[PDB]
Design a protein around this ligand. Sequence first.
Ligand SMILES: CCOc1c(F)cccc1C(=O)N(C)C
Lengths: 179, 245
Amino acid sequence: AIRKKLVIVGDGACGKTCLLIVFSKDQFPEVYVPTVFENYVADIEVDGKQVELALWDTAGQEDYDRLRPLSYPDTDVILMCFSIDSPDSLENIPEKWTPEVKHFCPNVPIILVGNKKDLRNDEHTRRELAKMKQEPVKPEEGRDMANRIGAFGYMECSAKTKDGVREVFEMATRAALQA
Amino acid sequence: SMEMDEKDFAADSWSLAVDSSFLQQHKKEVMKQQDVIYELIQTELHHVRTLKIMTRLFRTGMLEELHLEPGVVQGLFPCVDELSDIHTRFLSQLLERRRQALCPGSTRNFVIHRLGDLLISQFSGPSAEQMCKTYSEFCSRHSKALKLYKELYARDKRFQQFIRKVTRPAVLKRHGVQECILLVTQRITKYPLLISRILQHSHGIEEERQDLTTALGLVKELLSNVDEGIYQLEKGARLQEIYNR
Ligand SMILES: CCOc1c(F)cccc1C(=O)N(C)C
């Protein structure tokens, strides 16, 4: 197995920590959802290739511009997350997160991931967003942002139901393996 | 870690660590508060274990087996003794607060009601000045340690054999040298997340809510000072590159 490093970035409300927890346990915790994620090394076999994929979160580093870049050395793939229940988290992708990752991780593939996709059709979410003249992020809005920022691709998932989570990490492994 | 503490923190939560007959005696809000305090202590136990792998397995094994040039082991593991002393002392205080709270006849059933004062003490006065000095130094030497490790692993056969030997066991899967360095750098920014969630479930006693609010502010003051005090050191950087920052 070859060793690769993945880092997830995005705003504090994007669901990055929950995504790493659900993937690393293959389960949405039934008793207690952890507040933080330390690290994990996943054994993944994608398209016949075995990889040890080390996983890292940047949660807690969003306000600290000199500490946060210490998470980036030798990253092989970036997951850049936003929450589908937060058009504000998607607005911060192109001119805050993208220029930072392009600077510290040149030529590293970025996968833009829309988290919490289960909230797109949640009535409570639609009511709260309508008070700020907003609506859940549409799939075309996510794909267009991924296209504009030069992402390797666009994916969606729900940490709550686990739908799409395995696929995001198998594709991140393929992106990390590419020349 | 020692077996007594590993077993005390083996469960995924406080609600799974305590006896079910003891859990049943508490309100849901108390269970939510205790589950987050248990995560703060469990992750602190693991952080001190990361620092023991750095000092005992890596640093001391390199001094006792390899013929590295002087200053190289300190370059790989900057400030590790000072970091171990800070966190082993803090972990000792957290574990003593739990032990004092145990019910007679039990080694597992407890409730910690007064965490805020312990966090104010850790994150104020001389211990906070020491944490600020040590993390400003460690985090400024983080890139240099990673580069020194990669250079030695690629060029020195005995170093490569030593690393592959001591990191082979499955219990070291998440704890290679570079992984330990980044686990330590990231520890300090986990504290606000944990304290804020403990505070969310600590409104029942107003003195506790106030003390956790004071501790949260002190931790963010420490993080702001560390972040402003970092400048990455680089082997071979010339004075002109530095004064033209
Ligand atoms: C000044 C207090 O800092 C410490 C601490 F909080 C625990 C253990 C040791 C130390 C210490 O004196 N240094 C030099 C790190």
